[PDB]
Design a binder for this molecule. Structure first.
Ligand SMILES: CC(=O)SCCNC(=O)CCNC(=O)[C@H](O)C(C)(C)COP(=O)(O)OP(=O)(O)OC[C@H]1O[C@@H](n2cnc3c(N)ncnc32)[C@H](O)[C@@H]1OP(=O)(O)O
Length: 163
């Protein structure tokens, strides 16, 4: 290795089957908790280990340095971005953007062209740089009760251009 690697991981049924992945999931849980201090740790753990959620992990030298936890809604035509974070010492180097670009490529391949997410006010600018907007095109009837709403957050959407 010696270089960064992208891995789409998660818990398919039980996290005890693959210990390498389990270690990465715990690593993600910790990174998410550390960079998302206002989010209950038990809450982060619950979602990161939920079989319906996947996490695109950014690993360098076997260690998790960032990731995006998401949930795919193929029939609804979109994916919910649940957690997004890069460990502090690795931030401001381009990894956060690198992670989102990789996630976009993955979804273009699965033919899902919309991301929905609830952004904390002080993170809005990050999403805007990644092409997200406060203008929502996915109908409310399509996401209400599907995506989780948060306190004081702003719903934002990213329309992916397959090119
Ligand atoms: C659904 C949610 O998860 S909402 C919560 C989102 N997450 C967090 O707030 C957790 C704490 N923050 C982080 O983990 C990081 O700051 C991340 C993941 C947002 C960004 O990761 P990084 O690796 O630092 O970002 P990267 O180096 O790719 O920078 C992305 C670009 O966004 C820009 N940007 C604009 N506004 C912001 C902002 N509010 N925060 C961060 N970046 C911003 C940066 O200037 C940078 O552009 P530049 O390189 O041209 O200057």
């Amino acid at each position: 290795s010696g270089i960064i690697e992208f891995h789409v991981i998660g818990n398919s049924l039980t996290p005890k089957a693959n210990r390498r992945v389990l270690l990465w999931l715990v690593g993600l849980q910790n990174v998410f908790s550390h960079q998302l201090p206002r989010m209950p740790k038990e809450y982060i753990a619950r979602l990161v280990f939920d079989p319906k959620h996947k996490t695109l992990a950014l690993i360098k030298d076997g260690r998790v340095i960032g990731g995006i936890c998401f949930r795919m809604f193929p029939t609804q035509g979109f994916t919910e971005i649940v957690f997004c974070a890069v460990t502090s010492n690795e931030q401001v180097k381009g990894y956060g953007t690198h992670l989102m670009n990789h996630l976009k490529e993955y979804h273009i391949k699965h033919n899902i062209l919309y991301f929905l997410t609830y952004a904390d006010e002080y993170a809005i600018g990050y999403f805007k740089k990644q092409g997200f907007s406060k203008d929502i095109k996915v109908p409310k009837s399509r996401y209400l009760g599907y995506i989780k709403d948060y306190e004081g957050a702003t719903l934002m959407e990213c329309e992916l251009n397959p090119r």
